[PDB]
């Protein structure tokens, strides 16, 4: 089997991407944030505290003839941005772009933190990191990809995120028309539960490539590109007036700037992030100070190749016996 679904930016800055997901019988369609940095499929639901729902579409398991309460199971998750959610668990039929899993754990939110409530465009998350990170207790549950894998034509999914435009998530096949050149594959460590790999270096704009190993994760659920402070300083030093703002919480730059590109290494291959991809707009409405798309990972504890990086590439999440990651230009 295979599946293919369009993923769409939630707003004009690509702050996140949503992909429609069918849950239950009859289908209830929710727009989920596909997240290769976590491993829980959770949804706003009929069980979510009423005051914490503000415009999201909810899953109502009582209206699904295939929903079953997973007795005694609970979940609770906290993300790197300080947000969180928790609740109970059902199993139900879940389909993505024509690909169907029966008995998928659907984690129903009883509580969500304010940032989720305040974002009416995201109805939940669909985790695509390794199932070892799944938070369901006392019986850990598998991700959608883990459940589908054996049935897929090939044990892979691909992320092809757009810049200020829709893109595609495919399951079970590689669309050879969706990228240029070849796909360069690189080793993955699953030891921390992530799609963790090592970039071979970077360049800023038209500058020389610096060969240096940068360990990080391929994370579709993180908006920006988080790299070591040395690398980030080298990038922003090329932008007149850019500076790290303690009060804003990262590098900002004059909105009047044209940004340089940023290149990252994948083995001997090179992925070029155009400068415009690194502009995240005014820090507040009407401001001429703009938020940077490349930020320091110092204090995160890991480097994160988020959407800023991934959207410059066609990315293969290869779930073979020994997982790997593939990157191609597009």
Number of helices: 4
Termini separation comes to: 25 Å
Q: Taking Cα atoms only, what radius of gyration do you get, to the nearest Å?
A: 20 Å
How many runs of DSSP E, i.e. beta strands?
A: 24
GO biological process, one term: proteolysis
Catalytic activity: Hydrolysis of proteins with specificity similar to that of pepsin A, prefers hydrophobic residues at P1 and P1', but does not cleave 14-Ala-|-Leu-15 in the B chain of insulin or Z-Glu-Tyr. Clots milk
Active site: 35, 199
Organism: Cryphonectria parasitica (Chestnut blight fungus)
Topology:
Elements: E1 3-9, E2 17-23, E3 28-35, E4 41-43, E5 68-78, E6 84-96, E7 99-112, H1 114-117, E8 124-127, H2 144-148, E9 156-160, E10 167-171, E11 184-187, E12 196-204, E13 210-218, E14 225-227, H3 229-236, E15 243-245, E16 250-254, E17 262-266, E18 269-273, E19 279-282, E20 289-292, E21 294-296, E22 303-305, H4 307-310, E23 314-318, E24 324-328
Parallel strand pairs: 3-8, 4-7, 13-22, 14-21
Antiparallel strand pairs: 1-2, 1-10, 2-3, 2-6, 4-8, 5-6, 6-7, 9-10, 9-23, 11-24, 12-13, 12-17, 14-22, 15-16, 16-20, 17-18, 19-20, 23-24
Disulfide bonds: 255-290
Family: Belongs to the peptidase A1 family.
Keywords: Aspartyl protease, Disulfide bond, Hydrolase, Protease, Signal, Zymogen
Question: How does this structure look, described?
Answer:
- This protein has 330 residues and is mainly beta.
- It folds into two domains: 5-174, Cathepsin D, subunit A, domain 1 (Beta Barrel); 175-330, Cathepsin D, subunit A, domain 1 (Beta Barrel).
- 6% of the residues lie in helices and 44% in strands.
- The chain is built from four helices and 24 strands.
- The protein has helices at residues 114-117, 144-148, 229-236, 307-310, and strands at residues 3-9, 17-23, 28-35, 41-43, 68-78, 84-96, 99-112, 124-127, 156-160, 167-171, 184-187, 196-204, 210-218, 225-227, 243-245, 250-254, 262-266, 269-273, 279-282, 289-292, 294-296, 303-305, 314-318, 324-328.
- The protein has a seven-stranded mixed sheet. A six-stranded mixed barrel has the order 2-3-8-4-7-6.
- A hairpin with a 6-residue loop joins β19 and β20 (289-292).
């Amino acid at each position: 089997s295979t599946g293919s679904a369009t993923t769409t930016p939630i707003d004009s800055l690509d702050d996140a991407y949503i992909t429609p997901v069918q849950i239950g019988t009859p289908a209830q369609t929710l727009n989920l944030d596909f997240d290769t940095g976590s491993s829980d499929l959770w949804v706003f639901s009929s069980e979510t505290t009423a005051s914490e729902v503000d415009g999201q579409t909810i899953y109502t398991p009582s209206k699904s003839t295939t929903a079953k309460l997973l007795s005694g199971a609970t979940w609770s998750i906290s993300y790197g941005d300080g947000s969180s959610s928790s609740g109970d668990v059902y199993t139900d039929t879940v389909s993505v772009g024509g690909l169907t899993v029966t008995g998928q754990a659907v984690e129903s939110a009883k509580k969500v933190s304010s940032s989720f409530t305040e974002d009416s465009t995201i109805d939940g998350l669909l985790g695509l990191a390794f199932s070892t990170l799944n938070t369901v207790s006392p019986t850990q549950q598998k991700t959608f990809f883990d459940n589908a894998k054996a049935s897929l034509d090939s044990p892979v999914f691909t992320a092809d995120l757009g810049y200020h435009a829709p893109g595609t998530y495919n399951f079970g096949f590689i669309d050879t028309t969706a990228y240029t050149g070849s796909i360069t594959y690189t080793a993955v460590s699953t030891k921390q539960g992530f799609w963790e790999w090592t970039s071979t270096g970077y360049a800023v704009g038209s500058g020389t490539f610096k060969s240096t190993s940068i360990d990080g994760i391929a994370d579709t659920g993180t908006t920006l590109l988080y790299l070591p402070a040395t690398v980030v300083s080298a990038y922003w030093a090329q932008v007149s007036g850019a500076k790290s703002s303690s009060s804003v919480g990262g590098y900002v730059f004059p909105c009047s700037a044209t940004l340089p590109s940023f290149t990252f290494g994948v083995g001997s291959a090179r992925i070029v992030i155009p400068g415009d991809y690194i502009d995240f707009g005014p820090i507040s409405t009407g401001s001429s100070s703009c938020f940077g798309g490349i930020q320091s990972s110092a204090g995160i504890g890991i480097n994160i190749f988020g959407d800023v990086a991934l959207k410059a590439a066609f990315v293969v999440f290869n779930g073979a016996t020994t997982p790997t990651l593939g990157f191609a230009s597009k």
